[PDB]
Design a binder for this molecule. Structure first.
Ligand SMILES: [Cl-]
Ligand SMILES: [Cl-]
Ligand SMILES: [Cl-]
Ligand SMILES: [Cl-]
Ligand SMILES: [Cl-]
Ligand SMILES: [Cl-]
Ligand SMILES: [Cl-]
Ligand SMILES: [Cl-]
Ligand SMILES: [Cl-]
Ligand SMILES: [Cl-]
Ligand SMILES: [Cl-]
Ligand SMILES: [Cl-]
Ligand SMILES: [Cl-]
Ligand SMILES: [Cl-]
Ligand SMILES: [Cl-]
Ligand SMILES: [Cl-]
Ligand SMILES: [Mg+2]
Ligand SMILES: [Mg+2]
Ligand SMILES: [Mg+2]
Ligand SMILES: [Mg+2]
Lengths: 337, 337, 337, 337
């Protein structure tokens, strides 16, 4: 059959996932939705022409015997509650970041999932499904460059809104690097340090931008991550991994080249939504296919959600202290190995 | 509803389209199949776990009131017959190349389609859906380089089988360039000339490889197309369009870069099936979506099939004559404008 | 000692060579000059602060026992006369293109040089000394790509003056490709054909621009050379050699890259004089060093001058006829092997 | 006349400069040499066929009224003595790094030079004369990217000898970055911190390799410099400057590209001596031309030597302490502005 999916939270993110499941992907259907604003959920069912029940809350949606799996796409601080309820209802769950707002909240989810005996929770770190990152992972797993030693990366954005604050550089922005890098190199984070260059003219007075975040792993890999969210020129993700015997680097997004007016050039995307559309499609298709074929999910795990929560909190601490701060992680359970 | 598709011809190509419709794309289902070898069609229904009727021939399949659209993926010389039957049965049809084996056969299809009053026929020239070609088309349509003047392109393949013959360099290989280029520049072909370099050591004695094909358009654009099907190093498509004021060029397929052992490098694909998988997915999704949203197809047309048939025949003539040969095209009907 | 050089022709080209010998290179000095306009030669001696005698003509300059070698940098049609006189006077001679205006004139020079028993004549085809071309030659000589099969090249210039005529596309412009390519692949030219695309809006009404020149070698290498002298965007030399097993390509001139305003770009030079300055320096330094160390010159030869004269004439014939034209070359003497 | 140069120290470095002055450059001659090993100096005069006097020491060489300028190319710790003697003898001096082994020694030279009233001392930081760095400087001076904010750079070498020690990563290797970067951005260094990744398998047990050096300028520019001297793959210099509105990056050294065996690649040099040969030539030619045309030198100054000495010492301190260390610089004299 089609995997029958319910959606908890019908804002921009939920709508985009509803659109991809309904109009782009294979093997699933939206059969149920809920939102805090019931009127909004009804509008969504109408706009996307869904054959779906509108439920007043997640408890009633999760009680629907004909819902197999849910997307948790509500307000971030509301995610944890729905994830816990879904685990208890024994539904598969795809949770947009964050899994929970604290390490403790992630640990509550971890404890309950481990009881189930199979993986129900996939966290929405879509970078792992981007073709460039998949290529990097394959090269590393094949020992192409020997042991990784250093990672140099950048997350650049053209401009941010007036409400974007210093902490969000790590909470909303660097969190993607935080998830993908430890996955690439199969190592755990140990410490973080934040350094502030000269503030850019393109940043509002309350915002510290750019920033450099230096992260060391337990194995001794050193990551230097630049975050510059008012770079003006484009939305740009760059990542180079220096190994003992060679160096691998993430590609530019594909663009025709142009020779014109004394310049040889390619395009730089301006819109972050154009950068990872394929990865979002693949991540959800993987959720669907893994469930149908394996009876459990296969992507970033609740434990990856925990690592992101602990590490982001340490980075925010380091933003304030100017000192090297410890990333204190519990031992990874065999369940998540 | 799901668009209900029947498949005529369940060989490798038909199977791959069945796989994408069943497991990758949105909005369609395989409800019927037929193959000359009925046992093969039954095996296909079983292998892909289809809920589909096996019909003994295309006439019976096309008589099924619950088939909305068909794929024609049979032996090439058999395509024309099924396309004509499908038009008469008023079904939408996606036809793999060729539309027909002769200009005359394509004209028979054109005459019958024009009677219908809407487009039923989409021909499987998937290059138009490749992101690089879409980018080229957008640049041209926006006048980025002024008038196109010259096109330099190459279609390279690592090695061919013992049964690949000189004519197939244009019939099976260059036909893709033949379709995409006139579309890019909105011009008609007027003449073709073939020049043979030194034969490669990598080619079998009966095969002329490489070849250069020089094509001139009515507007005066000159295309120099290299075909080298035993290039050894990779499967490689290259295309540069020189305009009055600048030059645009198709990108390399996306690859991580590597610094190792004194070389800075990216990957070249070895497998043509890895080069255009995304384009095949997009072309079929467009077939489905166009039908459901517009009630007619929107891709390469029966007329494009005709242009390909006329032009390939002229190229094969030029391969034999060593002279400049005319491409004689009827006026394009308003139906296809 | 310093090699004592006399200069015959003190126009722009002669002045630039005088400047490089006097202010940039090692091991030579300008001791004598002559120009048709004696006042101009005197001004040159003063402007460059030379310790040099001004002679009324080349005969008197060549009679100076203390002149070891001469540069022939006069009006093109005047070159042949001075080269012949210098050979008879037993001086080494560096001759700017052309060696002579006709195949017959080049053959007169060849006959007289062969009598000398050592190479006196170096022709000013500086591309052979450009680092990119040297790299191409090394790769070819090391069999990196197997046998060369095809060459795709372009010679592009931003705009030309009102006096630039169709024939000059081959006589003044393509002549550089004509010299360098047969050297790269160690093959002789056999035929040429000219094809005219759509005329560019950037070309004046009397000029055919762009042009494509197709040249076949005796060994069966096919060269497609684009000439576009009003391309607007830059001065740009491109060259790709397709071999049996791989492909080599001339590099872009070195430029920093820029990410800015949605584009990732490098520089394209606008000024042809910036493209080959290093090659001009190296070619003259080689003239000097070869003479001092070997007692004979080592660069492009009088025979290379002959090949250029024959081939340019065939191309101009082909420009007019629209037909394939023969390049008729005498057998290369052992003297020039 | 030719600038008459004496050479103090005829080892490998002195010999290479003698070779370039004698056989490659314009306007100077080697008229005098001295070495601690007089037999070595005599051999050098013979090997290079110099018309030069061999002096027993630098005092006697500097007393030669017919010596205009000297190269100081002796053992590093011996440089300071000869530079001071040359300033007192009122000769122009080109000094290979280091200017002196301590900040105090550099300050002694600075004090004596300032008395002269014109610049006599040029320090051999050749990177400033490399075409890529010149291009970076021009872009910065033209405000192409707005204010520089961050610099990401790497100095990589394939392997080092058994005698290469941890301190040399900054003293001999990073010193080049240390000189060029403050010049590029016209800012002073304020602090340095060293971080050690996982040790490479390619490094001997006594050596800490790779290393990351984080340098902050007074203006707030943050530099992250990777040093990896056993990277195996090549000798490789990389440098990216992130500005407010865009990013500029040093180019790869020019190389033909190759498509072969499934890879599209360019060359990475293995030999550091091939990386900067042009810069060494240009730096010495500039020394010669500046003296002859301006009567004083124009390259990196004694003050730049001082900055390098102070900064290298701070980096070595940071290598040992693991803490952020201050770079304590005296105010730059107007003499050196
Ligand atoms: Cl919270
Ligand atoms: Cl965009
Ligand atoms: Cl999980
Ligand atoms: Cl614990
Ligand atoms: Cl047929
Ligand atoms: Cl492949
Ligand atoms: Cl059609
Ligand atoms: Cl007609
Ligand atoms: Cl003449
Ligand atoms: Cl320029
Ligand atoms: Cl010669
Ligand atoms: Cl003969
Ligand atoms: Cl010392
Ligand atoms: Cl090398
Ligand atoms: Cl100084
Ligand atoms: Cl002080
Ligand atoms: Mg853009
Ligand atoms: Mg590969
Ligand atoms: Mg420019
Ligand atoms: Mg190499």
């Amino acid at each position: 059959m089609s995997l029958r999916i319910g959606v908890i939270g019908t804002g921009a993110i939920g709508k985009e996932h509803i659109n991809r499941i309904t109009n782009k992907l294979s093997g699933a259907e939206i059969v149920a939705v809920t939102d805090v604003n019931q009127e909004a959920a009804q509008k969504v069912v109408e706009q996307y022409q869904l054959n779906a029940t509108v439920y007043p809350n997640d408890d009633s949606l999760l009680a629907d015997e004909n819902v197999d799996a849910v997307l948790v796409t509500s307000w971030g601080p509301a995610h944890e509650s729905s994830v816990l309820k879904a685990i208890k209802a024994q539904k598969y769950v795809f949770c947009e970041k964050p899994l929970a707002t604290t390490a403790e909240g992630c640990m509550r989810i971890v404890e309950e999932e481990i009881k189930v005996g199979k993986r129900l929770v996939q966290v929405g770190f879509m970078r792992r499904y981007d073709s460039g990152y998949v290529q990097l992972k394959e090269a590393l797993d094949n020992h192409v460059i020997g042991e990784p030693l250093m990672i140099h990366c950048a997350h650049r954005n053209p401009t941010v809104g007036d409400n974007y604050t210093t902490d969000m550089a790590v909470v909303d922005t660097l969190v993607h690097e935080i998830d993908v890098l430890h996955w690439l190199v199969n190592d755990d984070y140990e410490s973080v340090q934040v350094i502030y260059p000269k503030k850019s003219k393109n940043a509002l007075p309350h915002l510290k931008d750019p920033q450099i975040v230096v992260i060391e792993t337990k194995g001794g890999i050193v990551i230097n991550a630049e975050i510059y969210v008012n770079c003006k020129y484009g939305y740009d993700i760059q990542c180079e991994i220096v190994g003992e015997d060679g160096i691998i680097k993430l590609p530019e997004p594909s663009s025709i080249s142009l020779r014109k007016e004394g310049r040889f050039s390619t395009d730089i995307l301006m819109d972050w939504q154009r950068r990872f559309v394929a990865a979002y499609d693949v991540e959800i298709q993987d959720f669907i296919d893994s469930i149908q074929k394996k009876g459990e999910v296969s992507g970033p795990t609740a434990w990856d959600g925990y690592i992101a929560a602990v590490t982001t909190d340490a980075c925010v601490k380091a933003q304030e202290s100017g000192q090297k701060e410890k990333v204190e992680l519990k031992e990874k359970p065999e369940f998540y190995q």
